[PDB]
Amino acid sequence: NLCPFHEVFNATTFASVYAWNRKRISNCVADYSVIYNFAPFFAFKCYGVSPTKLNDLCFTNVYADSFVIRGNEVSQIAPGQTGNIADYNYKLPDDFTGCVIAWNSNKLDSKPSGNYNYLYRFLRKSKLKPFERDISTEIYQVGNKPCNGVAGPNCYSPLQSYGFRPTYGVGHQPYRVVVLSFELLHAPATVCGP
């Protein structure tokens, strides 16, 4: 029973980075060569595992976290990184095992007059713990005077829209990102990679 990797990578819509979508892959036989050999997925980078040995290993589960971010913000998707996305939207641990695949989706995620459907969090009371998700849209009190949860001066909505347009440099163009996180719990290894 082959895995849905192509169903995750070729999905028509990706989630906002603040609400990054996680899929569990288990009870399957995996094939990472198709992931590795496909041309457009150039931004390939794994930590604690090499792309060459992925077939030999087996894991209890494999998680696929998918989202859309800016091109220059892709560098923040790695162990030990800090920044907007690393702090408030999607944090990976320093001991992260599994890896991140990103590609430019300007052809399909960008829209003339801006794509405001992709949002990210830029204000939070504290950094995210690794693999934490925060979907709260409550108005963030940055000022001293509380504003009772309604937008106003010195209290804003914590989510910012990306506004992707077909133009702009590679840095500001949308990048669809998929993070394959491997897991071992001493349970039966339900995903092998022959």
Partner: antibody, heavy 115, light 108 residues
Framework: EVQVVESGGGLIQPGGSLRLSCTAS????????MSWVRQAPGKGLEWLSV???????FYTDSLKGRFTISVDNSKNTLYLQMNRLGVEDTAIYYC?????????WGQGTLVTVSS | EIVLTQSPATLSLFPGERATLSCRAS??????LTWYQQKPGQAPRLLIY???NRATGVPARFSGSGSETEFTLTISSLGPEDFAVYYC??????????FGQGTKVEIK
Amino acid sequence: EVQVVESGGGLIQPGGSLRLSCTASELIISRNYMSWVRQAPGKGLEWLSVIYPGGSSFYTDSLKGRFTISVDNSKNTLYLQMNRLGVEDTAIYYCVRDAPSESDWGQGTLVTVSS
Amino acid sequence: EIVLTQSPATLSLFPGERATLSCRASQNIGHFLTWYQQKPGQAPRLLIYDASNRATGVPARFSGSGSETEFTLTISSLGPEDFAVYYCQERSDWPRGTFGQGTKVEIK
């Protein structure tokens, strides 16, 4: 109107160190994007460093090692430790709060490095 | 590194005239650019953010336009108080970014 007040300027010898302080009244510095921007006399502005609401801090390449931004949550103030200052570090240092639609600057404090 | 070249270095106009100021970037920074007003001997003041949006409290005569590599700031009618130094700052890595050299406004 939002007011941010800087402090800790003045004279210092070359190669010395200084720590500027910045405080705000109507906002919480701990929960804001607070950046330090200097304006050399008769020269253009230069963004030096920022500290995020979560505590992440970033610096320009030319300043790496010599500057260290920080915050003390209890006092509601922002600090900029400055070390190994040269004659070119003389400038008026602004404590600026950044928001998506607002950018609130303080009046600044002159920092002079001379003998 | 992104370097912004503002032009003209000095813009000499009479009161009531329309002032058009240009900022040009070395790289495609999209719409991420900010315009700052600075009276002499005072801290800068936010005019335009995202290269087109007018900041709260700014009078309607100020407006921004342009994108990618060629940005422009327009004052529809110069009042006496509009005579100042205007800085363009790119915000590709907001709140980080480089500043332009600025453009003073003076006639007499």
